[PDB]
Design an enzyme around this catalytic site. Structure first.
Site, PDB file in Angstrom:
ATOM      1  N   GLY B  29       0.798  -1.230   0.000  1.00  0.00           N
ATOM      2  CA  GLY B  29       0.000   0.000   0.000  1.00  0.00           C
ATOM      3  C   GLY B  29       0.816   1.257   0.000  1.00  0.00           C
ATOM      4  O   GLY B  29       2.038   1.234  -0.037  1.00  0.00           O
ATOM      5  N   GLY B  96      -7.848  -3.321   1.326  1.00  0.00           N
ATOM      6  CA  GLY B  96      -8.309  -2.320   0.342  1.00  0.00           C
ATOM      7  C   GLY B  96      -7.507  -2.399  -0.940  1.00  0.00           C
ATOM      8  O   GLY B  96      -8.038  -2.096  -2.016  1.00  0.00           O
ATOM      9  N   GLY B  97      -6.261  -2.871  -0.855  1.00  0.00           N
ATOM     10  CA  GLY B  97      -5.432  -3.098  -2.069  1.00  0.00           C
ATOM     11  C   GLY B  97      -5.341  -4.519  -2.583  1.00  0.00           C
ATOM     12  O   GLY B  97      -4.417  -4.905  -3.324  1.00  0.00           O
ATOM     13  N   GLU B 103      -0.686 -10.814   3.183  1.00  0.00           N
ATOM     14  CA  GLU B 103      -0.471 -10.002   4.375  1.00  0.00           C
ATOM     15  C   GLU B 103      -0.780 -10.790   5.627  1.00  0.00           C
ATOM     16  O   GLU B 103       0.015 -10.768   6.638  1.00  0.00           O
ATOM     17  CB  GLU B 103      -1.290  -8.698   4.341  1.00  0.00           C
ATOM     18  CG  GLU B 103      -0.917  -7.720   3.243  1.00  0.00           C
ATOM     19  CD  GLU B 103      -1.951  -6.626   3.035  1.00  0.00           C
ATOM     20  OE1 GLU B 103      -3.035  -6.654   3.635  1.00  0.00           O
ATOM     21  OE2 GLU B 103      -1.694  -5.729   2.184  1.00  0.00           O
TER      22      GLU B 103
HETATM   23 CL    CL Z   1      -4.230  -4.634   0.832  1.00  0.00          CL
END
Ligand code: CL
Ligand code: BR
Ligand code: BR
Ligand code: CL
Ligand code: CL
Ligand code: CL
Ligand code: CL
Ligand code: CL
Lengths: 215, 218
Positions: B29, B96-97, B103
């Site tokens: 991000g 969101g990405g 992750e």
């Molecule tokens: Cl993300």
């Protein structure tokens, strides 16, 4: 063989109305698929959990549709590797663990066909398959060891969704629901082969004496 | 571009935790982008880098870092990443990405997770950002029906395919009263790869840059 056709024929008899049928994978399912020519007027839509079955269905004239287009499955019929006394299963030993489990999830009714050799009182002798994100493979293997399992990476196997498989040995799965849940929470686990949170609704079992018992 | 200054401050501050030779894990991000720029000054302590995304891996390579697969790396000593939301208990919403899966795997394999944010990410209650969920594409419609039953509004994220070959449903209008319970419940849905609640394993440290251009540590 004659036994397989009998168990598959029993299963097919559950197709009594116009339905979206889901088809599994494996050798007894092969006989089911042949038998489906006798139920064509009731098979509105077919979903398949595997390439082999799809090839076989297409050869008999069935159109096979993607699950997203089909919507809900009315009836899903498949085999299993192990079944306990509460219709809880181990599946995925062959191809298509994730596709099979999604199909069962989306099915109103799941009929599982087995022979008596696969019937056990406690799940675990047959190794439990777990589909994993490749980057997490080693991390997950370590967490499996903490649960008492022996993870073995399945060589030269890449799944439909680009993942790898760990086959887990040495578990005595006396609480399939709880172990299924636990495995679901391990980061990087896509699918595990315990079908207990959503067990089979009906199990058709071919007995040692070549008769059929419906559980 | 003040927000970008805040993001840079948080990232710089986090990099100060690189105080010994480590396996470093890198998030994804815009805030992490500023971290990656800062890593050039810590090059001699970073023995092994594990990346949570091909996006971050491009940026790392552009600055001459080698990236190693997690299976070879083993355990991560320190993982540094951003978040879309962070509550008072260092529980997060992420994805969101679209990199939430790798992750979350890095967090799981890390000894210490530092989350870097600007103050716009800090909330009192998680739930103000739609919840990303990575899903097996064949299960997309099935999972959307299940999300509706749970009380959310699933929206397929157009034109997005994750590094893992899957798709994203962003779940709108879903209250998160109990983040650990909901994270657990979503993990139970067949075809869900990972969900964007990071609560079962929360951040260990949150570094937040605030408008005064100050730092706040949680
Ligand atoms: Cl993300
Ligand atoms: Br056992
Ligand atoms: Br709030
Ligand atoms: Cl499909
Ligand atoms: Cl392994
Ligand atoms: Cl290597
Ligand atoms: Cl959808
Ligand atoms: Cl909770």
């Amino acid at each position: 063989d004659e036994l397989k056709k009998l168990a598959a024929t029993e299963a097919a008899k559950s197709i009594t109305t116009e339905i979206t049928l889901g088809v599994g994978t494996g050798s007894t399912v092969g006989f089911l698929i042949e038998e489906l020519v006798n139920y064509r007027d009731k098979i509105k839509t077919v979903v398949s959990s595997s390439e082999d079955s799809t090839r076989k269905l297409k050869a008999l004239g069935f159109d096979v549709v993607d699950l997203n287009y089909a919507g809900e499955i009315d009836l899903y019929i498949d085999g299993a590797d192990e079944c306990n006394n509460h219709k809880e299963l181990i599946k995925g030993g062959g191809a298509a663990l994730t596709r099979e489990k999604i199909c069962v999830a989306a099915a109103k009714k799941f009929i599982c066909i087995i022979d008596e050799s696969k019937k056990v009182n406690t799940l675990g002798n047959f190794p439990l398959p777990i589909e994993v994100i490749p980057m997490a493979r080693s991390y997950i293997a370590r967490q499996i060891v903490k649960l008492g399992g022996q993870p073995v990476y399945r060589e030269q196997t890449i799944t439909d969704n680009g993942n790898v498989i760990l086959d887990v040995y040495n578990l005595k799965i006396d609480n399939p629901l709880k172990l299924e849940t636990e495995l679901n929470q391990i980061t990087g686990v896509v699918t595990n082969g315990i079908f207990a949170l959503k067990p089979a609704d009906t199990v058709i079992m071919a007995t040692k004496d070549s008769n059929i018992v419906v559980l």
